[PDB]
Design a binder for these strands. Structure first.
Lengths: 125, 150
RNA sequence: UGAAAUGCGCAGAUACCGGGAGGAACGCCGAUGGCGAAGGCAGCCACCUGGUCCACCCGUGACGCUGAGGCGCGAAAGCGUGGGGAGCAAACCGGAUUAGAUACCCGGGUAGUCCACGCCCUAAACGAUGCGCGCUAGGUCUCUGGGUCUCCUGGGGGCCGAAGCUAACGCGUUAAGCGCGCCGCCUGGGGAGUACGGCCGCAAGGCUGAAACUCAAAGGAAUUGACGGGGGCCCGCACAAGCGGUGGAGC
């Protein structure tokens, strides 16, 4: 709509799925993608690093119309994929962006953590 | 690989090495004679049906038949992806010649006491003057496979 | 998860954003580092407090060393009362694997793990090496103080090594060397850290600690060898490349 060119990209990995949303210098999201956004179904789409890759690109390409060029990447959460590929899951997204055409100014890990909300199950703790 | 490339004596009729190679492809059981005859007779077939000189027709055929890119399997972290790759110039000829003879054998037409017509027809069909026939198909198919998995 | 299943989810889970509550731990810095007598101790802040090194050589003037029994401290688990409880998780309840699976793997889960007060007192509580002092080549890296600060000097942590020691492995100014002082401890293996007695403990248990009988060994280090999905280098029609074939039919 209204060219921005410089902005932020938030990569939110999880064991389930990857969702990336690009934003303005301000923080208001330009566009967003995920594995679901692309037509890929729940298990594979969601997590698969491949998916993360596709989602990353879709996010950038869509943002390209917005006139996006440079972006700061923020990584939140850890997650990946089951896939045979190395599938860090998060990394692929970080990669797809660097390649997508946008110049990535920086990668930053700001995974949130609770002070200590509630007990995790899932064999955690 | 199998061994160092041995140089081949050029063809008695037209002293072209490539021709001998083709002849070798045709021959089996070391019946070198029958093999040479089939190729020669085909060349005669190329002369009548087609105004062009056989030697030119054949070479053009091989060109159409040589695959530029082929896909080779490789094991990546997951699954074996088929990596596309160039083909050696040496490799391309062996594939082209081999594919011609195979496709030629493929043809229904059983002409001449032997195979000789199938070779004659196959080569013309190959030419890109006529770039059709079973030989070209394989060639086109491989290239298509490659760059599919670019 | 090897594959799975149990399990959770349409009373809407998972993934995503915001808000809140609660418990526990304290990423990077972080070390090959530091502190403490040991056990042990790592977010930041303040208060209270122990030990320790160096320089000056100023004060006392042998006031020293060790230390049976005592007293105190003493990881984890465990115990008592009360509190707390997010995650983790003996027992336990399920799923799977298996010949069986009272296990390893997966899903749950109570004590417990956290705090306070009291108790227990153990350990591969290890450097498997009691404390002090003196003496006996160096080299190298490191932490902390002084200096005339491309190195010297003091305290500490590592590595290599003189002399020497040691069964060997190894130790070697951080001694396992050369000496002196004092403490503790050993005396073949099993029976056995058991029995009995005593002392301690709420309890679990702890400390002390045998005998009969029995065996020619038990044992330490190192040597040759055999044995058991690390690395490097290199071969063979071993694979790949390629031509012909067996597996089908009849014989």
């Amino acid at each position: 709509d209204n060219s921005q060119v410089f902005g932020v990209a938030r990569i939110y990995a999880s064991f389930n799925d990857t969702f990336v949303h690009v934003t303005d210098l301000s923080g208001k999201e330009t566009i967003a993608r995920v594995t679901g956004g692309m037509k890929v179904k729940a298990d594979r789409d969601e997590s698969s690093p491949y998916a993360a890759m596709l989602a990353a690109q879709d996010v950038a390409a869509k943002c390209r119309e917005v006139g996006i060029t440079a972006v700061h990447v923020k990584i939140r959460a850890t997650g990946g994929t089951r896939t045979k590929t190395p599938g860090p899951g998060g990394q692929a997204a970080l990669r797809a962006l660097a390649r997508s055409g946008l110049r990535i100014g920086r990668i930053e890990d700001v995974t949130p953590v609770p002070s200590d909300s509630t007990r995790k199950k899932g064999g955690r703790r | 690989r199998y061994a160092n490339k041995r140089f081949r004596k050029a063809q008695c009729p037209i002293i072209e090495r490539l021709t001998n190679s083709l002849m070798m492809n045709g021959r089996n059981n070391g019946k070198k004679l029958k093999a040479v005859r089939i190729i020669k007779h085909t060349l005669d077939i190329i002369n009548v049906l087609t105004d062009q000189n056989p030697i030119q027709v054949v070479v053009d055929a091989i060109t159409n038949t040589g695959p530029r890119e082929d896909t080779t399997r490789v094991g990546g972290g997951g699954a074996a992806r088929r990596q596309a790759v160039d083909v050696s110039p040496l490799r391309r000829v062996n594939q082209a010649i081999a594919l011609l003879t195979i496709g030629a054998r493929e043809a229904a037409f059983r002409n001449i006491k032997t195979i000789a017509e199938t070779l004659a027809e196959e080569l013309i069909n190959a030419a890109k003057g006529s770039s059709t026939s079973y030989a070209i198909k394989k060639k086109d198919e491989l290239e298509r496979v490659a760059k599919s998995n670019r």
